[PDB]
DNA sequence: AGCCACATCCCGGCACTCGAAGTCCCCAACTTGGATGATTTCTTCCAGTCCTGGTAA
């Protein structure tokens, strides 16, 4: 699978597992963690399985060991040493005022508080063209979208069941639900 | 190899600095020569009383 220019790190990895047929939990644990362990023990010890936990700004001190795991993937998938690292969210070296935590992604630093940790929404009008969870949704200051007739990002309660893509890793549909093919200022607010 | 209890750990939060002039440095402190003789040191009288044995002829 090739990465998209605007793709989240977790989206790419989910697609990769699935592309190789590693659809189930047990093989997700396996095709990921056990292979890493058998390369070297450190690539696995630094690598918890749950998806939310995988990104750097969720991590503690042993980041370099997690990076080594990214580097093993870079070899396995015929990559480049920074192909994935250009996508990851890391600890900024810049305080952003009053000792706040701030998070750095290839040139843009966004304060910790604007990261939309829970209830990621989606836009069916773009998902039907290329189905992968995209970046710029994880931002708190971002409702609606550019293009697509505007309107609202279709929000978490799709059908009497809260949605996201991390506690339940499907893109087109989630849990009990279906394939989701379901006021004129926010399109300016959208430009983050 | 998978599941569960318990350790800590770091960010967001909170509170403090705290009134409000300075008061001199340094180096030296004395040598010598002698301390007196001649005499004497008290005497009279007195120094309480009564209670509180065991054992055998």
In angstroms, the CA A44 to CA A37 distance is: 5
Q: Which candidate, A24, A8, A16, places its Cα nearest to that of A84? A: A8
Which chain B positions come under 7 Å from a protein C-beta?
1-2, 9-12
Tokens of A184: 């004129």
Q: Which residue is nearest to nucleotide B2 (CA to C1')?
A: A26
**Torsion sign over Cα A24, A28, A31, A35:** negative
* Reduced DSSP (H G I as helix, E B as strand, rest coil) percent helix, strand, coil of chain A, to 5: 30, 10, 60
For residue A14, CA distances in Å to A95, A123, A170, A171, A189 come to 32, 19, 9, 9, 29
Experimental method: cryo-EM
Q: Which residues touch strand B (CB under 7 A)?
A: A 26, 29, 34, 60-61, 99-101, 112-113
Query: Rounded to an integer, what distance in angstroms lies between the CA atom of residue A119 and that of residue A141?
Result: 14
This PDB structure is determined at a resolution in Å of 3.5
DSSP secondary structure letters along A59-125: --S-HHHHHHHHHHHHHHTT--TTTTTTT--EE-S--TTTT--EEEETTEEEEGGGB--S---B-HH
């Amino acid at each position: 699978p090739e990465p998209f220019a605007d793709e989240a790190l977790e989206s790419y990895f989910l697609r990769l597992s699935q592309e190789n047929g590693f659809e189930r939990y047990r093989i997700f644990s396996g095709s990921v963690q056990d292979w890493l362990h058998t390369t070297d023990h450190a690539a696995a010890g630094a690598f918890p399985l749950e998806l939310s936990r995988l990104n750097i700004f969720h991590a503690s001190r042993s980041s370099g060991l997690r990076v080594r795991a990214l580097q093993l993937v870079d070899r396995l998938t015929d990559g480049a040493p920074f192909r994935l690292l250009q996508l990851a969210l890391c600890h900024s070296a810049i305080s952003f005022g009053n000792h706040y935590k701030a998070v750095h992604r290839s040139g843009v630093d966004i304060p910790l508080s604007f990261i939309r940790v829970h209830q990621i929404p989606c836009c069916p009008d773009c998902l039907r063209e290329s189905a992968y969870v995209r970046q710029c949704w994880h931002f708190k200051p971002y409702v609606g979208c550019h293009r697509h007739g505007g309107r609202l990002i279709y929000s978490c309660p799709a059908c009497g069941e809260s949605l996201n893509y991390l506690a339940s890793e499907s893109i087109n549909h989630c849990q009990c639900g279906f394939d989701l093919r379901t006021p004129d200022e926010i399109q300016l607010s959208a430009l983050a």
